[PDB]
Write a protein that binds this ligand. Structure first.
Ligand SMILES: Cc1cc2nc3c(=O)[nH]c(=O)nc-3n(C[C@H](O)[C@H](O)[C@H](O)COP(=O)(O)OP(=O)(O)OC[C@H]3O[C@@H](n4cnc5c(N)ncnc54)[C@H](O)[C@@H]3O)c2cc1C
Ligand SMILES: CN(C)[C@@H]1C(O)=C(C(N)=O)C(=O)[C@@]2(O)C(O)=C3C(=O)c4c(O)ccc(I)c4C[C@H]3C[C@@H]12
Length: 368
């Protein structure tokens, strides 16, 4: 159905690599073009958890579920207030494979990459421009040779700049903001807080500020602080750690010293306004050649419903299935169908994540 043709996946995240695998195992010629310099580029962020009905199904179809279980770490959850512990949900042994197990992002990438043929991914390729030829797409990469493909799948994340041939829809800010950081040797560097986590994830919310932590992301503590974006904003510089610290100390002044210590020992902070790429409007029905989008390029949504990668890996599964069978008359029909399905579950997820985002920042929120 792609019989004499080649496919170009833009972006080698979890969604794009998985796409690559499901396509490659059906004999389809595919390349992944990835901005990052090489296999070993550190991916910043906390862990991902694949769910039994969605994410795990993609891995299962990929022959990678067991490997995901082997590397993934199930975790409990503690809910704390701006000092003490309010609930402790440890994982029960029949729930430990179950829509739980936390995996590190480099670990996940290493599983996917290893499952692929050699030289499927081409590194150090930043797609800047896309241009429709007669029977093929011409792809322009910063300071590197251009390439052509019959079908482009955009898997290049929520801030993809190369979406115009699918949709004119734009990324939007939702009104909240996130500060993320890693602490190494958390047991040395934030002892008291590491001891509150006690090997579990931790969440606390108080007076509009939400704190989330995972104490064991391959031995690093990853934490996030989220809040309604200030009307003043931006007016904090994420390059000057001092300006961030000062801001967080004002905001967190009521909180226990163990949380303050977290802000104190962090070397480097990443500030990111929550964004949504809303599935508000249908995508373009007239397109010059075959192109589509999966993952966060398709449906970037706030990270508070835990959804995100899961619906992206479902996109992978539905799309590859659709491309394989030759049930459809044309690539263009296969894409249309995938997109129809994705609009439905994607909108579901976006509503869930939006409503949770609203719920959580509602002034008097508590996690139970
Ligand atoms: C702070 C934060 C916390 C999150 N927490 C969770 C969570 O707990 N659970 C969850 O399910 N989701 C979470 N998400 C969402 C989740 O991380 C993403 O949904 C997932 O990584 C999306 O996969 P993706 O591969 O589609 O996008 P990405 O993961 O963003 O992959 C995009 C890839 O494309 C590359 N790329 C970008 N531009 C180009 C280009 N021009 N050319 C070539 N390559 C390019 C990038 O290098 C990257 O490799 C979170 C997101 C954020 C920001
Ligand atoms: C991205 N950032 C806002 C948060 C974060 O920093 C962490 C983390 N552990 O560092 C996370 O754990 C996070 O990625 C994350 O995983 C979250 C969830 O899984 C989640 C959920 O599944 C259902 C309801 C709620 I409500 C949440 C909270 C979300 C918090 C997310």
């Amino acid at each position: 159905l792609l019989s004499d043709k080649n496919v170009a996946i833009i972006g080698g995240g979890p969604v794009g690599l998985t796409m690559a695998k499901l396509l490659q195992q059906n004999g389809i010629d595919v390349s992944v073009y990835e901005r990052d310099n090489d296999r070993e580029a550190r991916i910043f962020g906390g862990t991902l958890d694949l769910h039994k009905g969605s994410g795990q199904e993609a891995m299962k179809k990929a022959g990678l579920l067991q490997t995901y279980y082997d590397l993934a770490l199930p975790m409990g959850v503690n809910i704390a207030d701006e000092k003490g512990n309010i609930l402790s949900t440890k994982n029960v042994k029949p729930e430990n494979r179950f829509d739980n197990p936390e995996i590190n992002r480099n670990d996940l990438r290493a599983i996917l990459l290893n499952s692929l043929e050699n030289d499927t991914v081409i590194w150090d390729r930043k797609l800047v421009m896309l241009e429709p030829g007669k029977k093929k797409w011409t792809l322009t990469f910063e300071n590197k040779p251009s390439e052509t493909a019959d079908l482009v799948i955009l898997a290049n994340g929520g801030m993809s700049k190369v979406r115009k041939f699918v949709t004119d829809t734009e990324v939007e800010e939702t009104g909240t903001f996130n500060i993320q950081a890693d602490i190494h040797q958390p047991e040395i560097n934030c002892p008291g807080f590491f001891q509150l986590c006690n090997g579990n994830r931790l969440m606390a919310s108080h007076q509009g500020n939400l704190l989330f932590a995972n104490p064991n992301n391959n031995g690093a503590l990853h934490f996030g602080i989220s809040f309604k974006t200030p009307d003043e904003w931006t007016q904090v510089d994420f390059q000057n750690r001092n300006s961030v610290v000062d801001f967080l100390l004002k905001e967190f002044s009521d909180w226990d010293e163990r949380y303050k210590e977290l802000i104190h020992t962090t070397l480097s902070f990443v500030g990111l306004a929550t964004r949504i790429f809303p599935l508000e409007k249908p995508w373009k029905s007239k397109r010059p050649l075959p192109i589509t989008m999966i993952g966060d390029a398709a449906h970037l949504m706030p990270p508070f419903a835990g959804q995100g990668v899961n619906s992206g890996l479902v996109d992978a599964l539905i799309l590859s299935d659709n491309l394989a069978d030759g049930k459809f008359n044309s690539i263009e029909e296969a894409v249309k169908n995938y997109e129809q399905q994705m609009f439905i579950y994607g909108k579901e997820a976006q509503e869930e994540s939006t409503q949770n985002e609203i719920e959580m920042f509602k002034p008097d929120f508590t996690f139970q």
